[PDB]
């Protein structure tokens, strides 16, 4: 985040005082913005007829293949009395809605118009009460009258109805009319009414839990005891008459079974099956036990004949309990609903998994067998829409199933709904009996219910359940044509809560939610494949509410940022890492393309003339493509590189712009450019640090990929139009004005540059090499950057350097720019010592560097002091830079160690020294001067001395050069003539020719024939030096020149050659240097160091014997044998060392004469 950020923040201030610029573009710009406004609400109108199945005062929220939800043209908000309970009752079989609270009852038509719908008030009595604070239950009846129910052709009533039934306490009262109800007193009322005294209480602990109809044979209704009362409550054919039918209710009577069980215990669910006709229902009886009993009701039958019998609690546990134990716990029925076969029900249960610590909700479809009292368990399905228990007796879950009973061969599948308090869980499942299908495995889909709204009450028909919301009224969750089985297939889990998130958000004001984060982990593969057929459809307008355009290229963008911004949010947040690190920046880099792209064609049209240049560069586009009519699809959607059809256009206006500048043009073209880079830079900058805890900041590159806005032809066309822009502007001296345009320009141009080279470096090494495209980048950034910094210095945009040279490197920048601020601002000080702190290598080394050139010598000992320890490594520099005048200031300091090896330098340009003569030889007097004023500082002493001694070496070189230029090497000892001559001829002609100095002729020269005015040295050194380069080396050329010193003495009879060379070696106390032996039979040691480095390689380039030469000195070596084989040889060497042994007191050890060490 850090540097680019701030660096941002500096941008603005500076630039943005002074700065004029002009152009007309205005035009074009807001007639942009209309057209493309238009464009949207044409594609909004082809929504709402799509997405609407049911819009006046409906709204539908969503819509799928398996559903539509929406909302009736009623709500339950208005002229209402909230009180503690609401208890909502749903009749469909009259249509009519029914919801009470504690001081009213309202009767409504549910599929009438406003939300200020006329209500059918009843006011209850205040003579009776049990508005106490809990709600009375009251419930309608089925009309019957008037050709057996009101007609529905004739609008006879608001609502067609029978009567209604009020339990106030103890007391059932059946008025027969709602509408005959005095207002004001209620004994009135009464006359019409006929009222029964239930032996419960509807305000106790005894309430009735449930009111059920099961007309025309009566009513059947359970309390929270388990007490069954069976009330006929009318004669038929209206008119009020409750009696007590039947207790079903018993200590399951009579002996031996009656202390036994008991039926006294609560039952859960009561549905109703079927009407037979005349006063028969078929009725479901569901309990805790987990007994299903199929009651036959009769008025047409000859007996109540109960079909089904059987037993279930214990069947779940013949598979979960089998093998594993994840049916332990808790087995608790809640909830019984018939299917289209109303011989199977589907079972709602939940089992606590604590193995797991899940909880699974068990759909268990058994088909019973009346026959004999069977089941069969043909499907069990679990939910994973939670995994966590839901225990609560105030909100019990139930299945609600809107089956058919019409036909039931319509749809192969059945939708089950499972209500809870948080959602409405929509799932399928199958019916086919046969042996060759999965009876698991199916779709779930979820529709998520806001906690505040909730579920009053609710009823179905046989195809949609309608159920009452707390202010929203009746929603009709209505069941389509869903797809049966997985014969016939469908859609996805994943796949259709990514449409919600996109699409049905945009429908506001409901109770339906539409992100939703994963409830049950799947694999990131999956999860990715439907987020990408999402992501094509928004992307080339192959959407399902999305028109490819119905205007023009540019025209069409604008929709699908609304689109888009839907899904990013929802992708961000839920599937954060069910994804891979690619995917989801892929999708934020359309989205960024795209914002740019929509200012972008707003802005390019700008003048009249140069709108229609626009347009016949953009059909040029097209005709590349294949063909051509003018208008492809690939710049009606965006390619993520629009910019690259009209770009090497304005690129070329920029060119003719330099050399012949057209007045207002210099303005227009300034401001064209400022423009479209601040939309689309600001657009671009900022969705990326959404994207900071997504992965990236700006200032990174992921490993496979780059943004595509970073990409080599961009920057080539924005770095080439910058310096025409600058000269022209420069001249002029209306630079200033443009300051803003000129920052804009160069902090891009970096940035793309920079994060370009964390890209490359991401890249294997072989592939690096591969490529010479990346370094066509490299040197695109590197010959223009240098430059950049000092137009914006110009500009005083010298503290944006400062940023600049912070971020991007630019470390020589860095000190020129705070040189120029002084140090009595406490904030400049600090400008140093951060960027030392930040770099302690190579922001202080390049500073010394810069130092030394700009003549700032106070500078680099004394104000940056604590950066001392890389200023020793500067020293090592062979030379610092600044030319022959630095190595002046470096003896000048105290600092003599960079100039010695400076001094190298010096001595072999010819430019420094060798001027002239006089110049020449005054500058070598003054390299001598210098070493005189070596301190203690820099221990250069050493140095001091070779500089002294560097005349006389040249002395030396061109002494003995001299000498062999005039034949002055002699010729071999070996025959007549020596070898090296026919060499040595050769190289001092081709010298002697006046013609240019040939280096190599001088250098083999100059070694390889020996002056004997220098043949003492190397007796010398080996005396001194020679113990060092081993004995044997040592002794080996000692007995060379000893071997020749004796092959003389001998040959003839006059030694006295004997004693002066080893007299010689006592004058500078050669023998107490110690292993240096005296002229003196070389026998056998001579010859053993002789062989191993026989070849001299000397003779080896000459043509003939080449080692033969070791063989004839092997001959030289046997002739002092065979004289010491005389020991006439042996008389003279005694005698006349030992005389000289007399004045020099020496030890002789004769017979081989050797001083003793």
Same mark, same amino acid.
């Given at each position: 985040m850090s540097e680019k950020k701030v660096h941002l923040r500096l941008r603005k201030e500076l630039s943005v005082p002074i700065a004029v610029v002009e152009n007309e573009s205005l035009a074009q710009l807001s007639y942009e913005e209309e057209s493309q406004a238009s464009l949207m609400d044409i594609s909004m109108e082809q929504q709402q007829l799509r997405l609407h199945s049911h819009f006046d005062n409906s709204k539908v929220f969503t819509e799928n293949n398996r559903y539509i939800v929406k909302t009736l043209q009623t709500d339950y908000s208005s002229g209402f009395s909230n009180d503690d309970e609401l208890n909502g009752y749903i009749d469909m079989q009259i249509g009519y809605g029914l919801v009470n609270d504690h001081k009213k009852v309202y009767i409504w038509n549910i599929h009438s118009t406003q939300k200020d719908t006329p209500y059918i008030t009843v006011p209850f009595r205040s003579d009776d009460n049990d508005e106490i604070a809990v709600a009375p239950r009251c419930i309608l009846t089925f009309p019957a009258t008037m050709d057996e129910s009101p007609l529905a052709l004739n609008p006879n009533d608001q609502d067609e109805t029978g009567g209604l039934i009020i339990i106030k306490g103890s007391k059932a009262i059946y008025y027969e009319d709602i509408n005959s109800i005095n207002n004001l007193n209620f004994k009135l009322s009464e006359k019409f009414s006929h009222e029964l005294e239930l032996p419960i209480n509807s305000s106790g602990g005894e309430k009735c839990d449930l009111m059920l109809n099961c007309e025309p044979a009566g009513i059947v209704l359970s309390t929270n005891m388990g007490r069954i009362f069976f009330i006929t409550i009318r004669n038929s054919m209206g008119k009020p008459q409750l009696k007590l039918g039947k207790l079903l209710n018993k200590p399951f009577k009579l002996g031996i079974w009656s202390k036994i069980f008991n039926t006294n215990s609560s039952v859960v669910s009561l549905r109703n099956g079927p009407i037979l006709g005349k006063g028969t229902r078929l009725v479901y009886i569901t309990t805790n036990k987990g007994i299903f009993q199929t009651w036959q009701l009769s008025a047409t039958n000859s007996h109540p004949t109960k079909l089904i019998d059987v037993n279930i609690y214990e069947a779940i546990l013949e598979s979960l309990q089998d093998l594993y134990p994840f049916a332990h716990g808790t087995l608790k029925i809640w909830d019984s609903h018939p299917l289209q076969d109303e011989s199977s029900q589907l079972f709602l249960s939940s089992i606590y998994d604590s193995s797991c610590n899940e909880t699974y909700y068990i759909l268990s479809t058994i088909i019973f067998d009346s026959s004999s009292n069977s089941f069969t368990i043909f499907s069990t399905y679990r939910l994973n +829409? &939670?995994?966590? =228990?839901? +225990? /609560?007796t105030k909100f019990k879950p139930k299945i609600f199933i809107p089956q058919m009973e019409n036909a039931n061969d319509t749809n192969e599948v059945t939708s089950i709904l499972v209500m809870f308090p948080n959602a409405v869980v929509i799932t399928q499942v199958n019916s086919k #009996? /046969?042996? =060759?299908?999965?009876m698991r495995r199916k779709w779930e889909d979820i529709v998520s219910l806001r906690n505040d709204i909730d579920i009053i009450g609710s009823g179905y028909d046989s195809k949609s359940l309608y159920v009452l919301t707390k202010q929203m009224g009746v929603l009709q969750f209505f069941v389509k044509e869903n797809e049966e089985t997985n014969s016939k297939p469908e859609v996805g889990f994943v796949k259709s809560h990514v449409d919600q998130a996109v699409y049905f958000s945009k429908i506001n004001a409901n109770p339906i939610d539409f992100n939703l984060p994963p409830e049950i982990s799947l694999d990131q593969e999956s999860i990715e494949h439907d987020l990408k057929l999402t992501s094509e459809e928004i992307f080339h307008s192959n959407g399902k509410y999305i028109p490819p355009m119905l205007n023009t290229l540019g025209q069409h963008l604008s929709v699908r940022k609304e689109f888009f911004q839907n899904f990013l949010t929802f992708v961000a947040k839920n599937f954060n890492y069910k994804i891979s690190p690619e995917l989801k920046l892929d999708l934020i880099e359309k989205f960024e393309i795209l914002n740019c792209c929509i200012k972008f064609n707003s802005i390019i049209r700008q003048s009249d003339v140069l709108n229609d240049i626009w347009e016949k560069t953009l059909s040029n586009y097209n005709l590349t493509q294949n063909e051509h009519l003018t208008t492809k699809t690939v710049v009606i @959607? =965006? !390619? $993520?590189? &629009? !910019?690259v059809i009209f770009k090497q256009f304005l690129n070329h206006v920029v060119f003719v712009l330099f050399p012949s500048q057209n007045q207002n043009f210099k303005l227009n073209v300034t401001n064209l450019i400022n423009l479209c880079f601040y939309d689309g830079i600001l657009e671009e900058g900022e969705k990326t640090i959404r994207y900071e805890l997504l992965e990236l900041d700006p200032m990174e590159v992921d490993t496979s990929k780059l943004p595509w806005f970073i990409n080599f032809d961009y920057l080539n066309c924005i770095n080439q139009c910058f310096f025409d822009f600058t000269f022209a502007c420069e001249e002029e001296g209306s630079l200033d004005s443009y300051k803003e345009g000129l920052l804009k320009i160069v902090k891009i141009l970096y940035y793309q540059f920079n994060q370009f080279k964390i890209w490359i470096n991401t890249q294997p090494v072989k592939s690096v090499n591969a490529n010479d495209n990346f370094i066509n980048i490299n040197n695109l950034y590197d010959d223009n950057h240098l430059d950049w910094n000092h137009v914006l210095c110009k500009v005083n945009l010298k503290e944006q350097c400062i940023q600049i040279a912070e971020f991007y490197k630019d470390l020589s920048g860095l000190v020129q720019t705070l040189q120029t #601020? $002084?140090? @009595? /601002?406490s904030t400049t000080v600090s400008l140093y010592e951060t960027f030392f702190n930040e770099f302690p290598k190579e922001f202080s080394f390049t500073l010394f560097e810069y130092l030394i050139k700009h003549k700032k010598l106070n500078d680099l000992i004394f104000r940056f002091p604590q950066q001392h320890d890389v200023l020793i490594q500067f020293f090592q520099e062979s030379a610092p830079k600044y030319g022959h005048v630095a190595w002046i200031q470096q003896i000048l300091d105290g600092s003599y160690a960079d100039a010695m090896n400076t001094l190298k330098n010096i001595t072999v340009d010819d430019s420094k020294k060798g001027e002239s003569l006089s110049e020449c030889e005054l500058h070598l007097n003054v390299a001598k001067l210098s070493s005189l004023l070596v301190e203690k500082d820099n221990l250069d002493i050493n140095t001091l001395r070779k500089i002294q001694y560097n005349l006389d070496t040249i002395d030396a070189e061109k002494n003995i050069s001299n000498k062999l230029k005039k034949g002055e090497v002699q010729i071999c000892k070996r025959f007549k003539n020596g070898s090296i001559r026919e060499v040595f001829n050769i190289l001092v002609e081709e010298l002697k020719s006046t013609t240019v100095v040939n280096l190599s002729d001088l250098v083999e020269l100059y070694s390889m024939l020996d002056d004997e005015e220098s043949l003492f040295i190397p007796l010398r050194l080996l005396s001194v030096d020679g113990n060092l380069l081993n004995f044997e080396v040592k002794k080996f050329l000692n007995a060379l020149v000893w071997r020749r010193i004796v092959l003389l003495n001998a040959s003839n009879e006059g030694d006295k050659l004997l004693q002066h060379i080893v007299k010689r070696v006592f004058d500078e106390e050669l023998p107490k240097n110690n292993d240096f032996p005296l002229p003196s039979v070389d026998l056998l040691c001579d010859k053993s160091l002789l062989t191993p480095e026989y070849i001299s390689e000397t003779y080896g380039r000459f043509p003939i014997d080449q080692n033969a030469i070791r063989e004839e000195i092997y001959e030289e070596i046997s002739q002092v044998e065979t004289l010491n084989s005389d020991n006439s040889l042996e008389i003279k060497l005694h005698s006349t060392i030992g005389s000289v042994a007399k004045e020099k007191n020496y030890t002789i050890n004769y017979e081989t004469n050797t001083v003793e060490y």
């Amino acid at each position: 985040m850090s540097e680019k950020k701030v660096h941002l923040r500096l941008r603005k201030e500076l630039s943005v005082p002074i700065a004029v610029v002009e152009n007309e573009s205005l035009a074009q710009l807001s007639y942009e913005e209309e057209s493309q406004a238009s464009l949207m609400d044409i594609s909004m109108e082809q929504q709402q007829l799509r997405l609407h199945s049911h819009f006046d005062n409906s709204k539908v929220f969503t819509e799928n293949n398996r559903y539509i939800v929406k909302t009736l043209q009623t709500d339950y908000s208005s002229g209402f009395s909230n009180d503690d309970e609401l208890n909502g009752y749903i009749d469909m079989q009259i249509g009519y809605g029914l919801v009470n609270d504690h001081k009213k009852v309202y009767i409504w038509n549910i599929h009438s118009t406003q939300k200020d719908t006329p209500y059918i008030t009843v006011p209850f009595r205040s003579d009776d009460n049990d508005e106490i604070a809990v709600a009375p239950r009251c419930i309608l009846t089925f009309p019957a009258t008037m050709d057996e129910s009101p007609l529905a052709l004739n609008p006879n009533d608001q609502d067609e109805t029978g009567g209604l039934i009020i339990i106030k306490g103890s007391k059932a009262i059946y008025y027969e009319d709602i509408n005959s109800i005095n207002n004001l007193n209620f004994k009135l009322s009464e006359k019409f009414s006929h009222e029964l005294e239930l032996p419960i209480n509807s305000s106790g602990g005894e309430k009735c839990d449930l009111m059920l109809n099961c007309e025309p044979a009566g009513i059947v209704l359970s309390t929270n005891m388990g007490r069954i009362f069976f009330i006929t409550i009318r004669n038929s054919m209206g008119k009020p008459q409750l009696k007590l039918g039947k207790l079903l209710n018993k200590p399951f009577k009579l002996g031996i079974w009656s202390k036994i069980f008991n039926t006294n215990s609560s039952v859960v669910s009561l549905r109703n099956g079927p009407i037979l006709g005349k006063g028969t229902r078929l009725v479901y009886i569901t309990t805790n036990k987990g007994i299903f009993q199929t009651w036959q009701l009769s008025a047409t039958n000859s007996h109540p004949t109960k079909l089904i019998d059987v037993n279930i609690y214990e069947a779940i546990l013949e598979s979960l309990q089998d093998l594993y134990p994840f049916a332990h716990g808790t087995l608790k029925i809640w909830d019984s609903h018939p299917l289209q076969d109303e011989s199977s029900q589907l079972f709602l249960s939940s089992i606590y998994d604590s193995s797991c610590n899940e909880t699974y909700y068990i759909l268990s479809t058994i088909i019973f067998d009346s026959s004999s009292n069977s089941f069969t368990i043909f499907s069990t399905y679990r939910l994973n +829409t &939670f995994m966590e =228990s839901i +225990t /609560d007796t105030k909100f019990k879950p139930k299945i609600f199933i809107p089956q058919m009973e019409n036909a039931n061969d319509t749809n192969e599948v059945t939708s089950i709904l499972v209500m809870f308090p948080n959602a409405v869980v929509i799932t399928q499942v199958n019916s086919k #009996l /046969d042996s =060759s299908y999965s009876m698991r495995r199916k779709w779930e889909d979820i529709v998520s219910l806001r906690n505040d709204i909730d579920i009053i009450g609710s009823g179905y028909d046989s195809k949609s359940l309608y159920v009452l919301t707390k202010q929203m009224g009746v929603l009709q969750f209505f069941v389509k044509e869903n797809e049966e089985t997985n014969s016939k297939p469908e859609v996805g889990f994943v796949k259709s809560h990514v449409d919600q998130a996109v699409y049905f958000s945009k429908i506001n004001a409901n109770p339906i939610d539409f992100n939703l984060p994963p409830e049950i982990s799947l694999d990131q593969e999956s999860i990715e494949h439907d987020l990408k057929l999402t992501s094509e459809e928004i992307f080339h307008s192959n959407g399902k509410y999305i028109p490819p355009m119905l205007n023009t290229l540019g025209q069409h963008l604008s929709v699908r940022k609304e689109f888009f911004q839907n899904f990013l949010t929802f992708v961000a947040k839920n599937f954060n890492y069910k994804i891979s690190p690619e995917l989801k920046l892929d999708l934020i880099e359309k989205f960024e393309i795209l914002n740019c792209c929509i200012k972008f064609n707003s802005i390019i049209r700008q003048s009249d003339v140069l709108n229609d240049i626009w347009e016949k560069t953009l059909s040029n586009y097209n005709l590349t493509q294949n063909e051509h009519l003018t208008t492809k699809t690939v710049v009606i @959607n =965006s !390619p $993520d590189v &629009f !910019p690259v059809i009209f770009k090497q256009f304005l690129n070329h206006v920029v060119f003719v712009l330099f050399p012949s500048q057209n007045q207002n043009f210099k303005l227009n073209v300034t401001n064209l450019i400022n423009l479209c880079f601040y939309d689309g830079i600001l657009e671009e900058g900022e969705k990326t640090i959404r994207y900071e805890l997504l992965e990236l900041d700006p200032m990174e590159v992921d490993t496979s990929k780059l943004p595509w806005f970073i990409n080599f032809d961009y920057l080539n066309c924005i770095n080439q139009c910058f310096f025409d822009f600058t000269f022209a502007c420069e001249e002029e001296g209306s630079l200033d004005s443009y300051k803003e345009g000129l920052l804009k320009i160069v902090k891009i141009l970096y940035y793309q540059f920079n994060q370009f080279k964390i890209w490359i470096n991401t890249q294997p090494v072989k592939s690096v090499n591969a490529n010479d495209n990346f370094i066509n980048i490299n040197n695109l950034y590197d010959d223009n950057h240098l430059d950049w910094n000092h137009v914006l210095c110009k500009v005083n945009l010298k503290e944006q350097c400062i940023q600049i040279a912070e971020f991007y490197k630019d470390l020589s920048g860095l000190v020129q720019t705070l040189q120029t #601020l $002084d140090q @009595n /601002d406490s904030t400049t000080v600090s400008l140093y010592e951060t960027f030392f702190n930040e770099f302690p290598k190579e922001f202080s080394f390049t500073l010394f560097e810069y130092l030394i050139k700009h003549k700032k010598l106070n500078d680099l000992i004394f104000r940056f002091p604590q950066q001392h320890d890389v200023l020793i490594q500067f020293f090592q520099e062979s030379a610092p830079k600044y030319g022959h005048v630095a190595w002046i200031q470096q003896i000048l300091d105290g600092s003599y160690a960079d100039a010695m090896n400076t001094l190298k330098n010096i001595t072999v340009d010819d430019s420094k020294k060798g001027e002239s003569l006089s110049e020449c030889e005054l500058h070598l007097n003054v390299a001598k001067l210098s070493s005189l004023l070596v301190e203690k500082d820099n221990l250069d002493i050493n140095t001091l001395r070779k500089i002294q001694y560097n005349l006389d070496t040249i002395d030396a070189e061109k002494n003995i050069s001299n000498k062999l230029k005039k034949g002055e090497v002699q010729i071999c000892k070996r025959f007549k003539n020596g070898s090296i001559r026919e060499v040595f001829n050769i190289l001092v002609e081709e010298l002697k020719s006046t013609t240019v100095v040939n280096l190599s002729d001088l250098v083999e020269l100059y070694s390889m024939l020996d002056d004997e005015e220098s043949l003492f040295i190397p007796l010398r050194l080996l005396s001194v030096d020679g113990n060092l380069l081993n004995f044997e080396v040592k002794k080996f050329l000692n007995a060379l020149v000893w071997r020749r010193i004796v092959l003389l003495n001998a040959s003839n009879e006059g030694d006295k050659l004997l004693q002066h060379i080893v007299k010689r070696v006592f004058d500078e106390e050669l023998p107490k240097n110690n292993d240096f032996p005296l002229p003196s039979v070389d026998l056998l040691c001579d010859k053993s160091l002789l062989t191993p480095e026989y070849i001299s390689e000397t003779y080896g380039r000459f043509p003939i014997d080449q080692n033969a030469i070791r063989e004839e000195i092997y001959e030289e070596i046997s002739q002092v044998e065979t004289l010491n084989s005389d020991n006439s040889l042996e008389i003279k060497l005694h005698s006349t060392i030992g005389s000289v042994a007399k004045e020099k007191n020496y030890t002789i050890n004769y017979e081989t004469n050797t001083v003793e060490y």
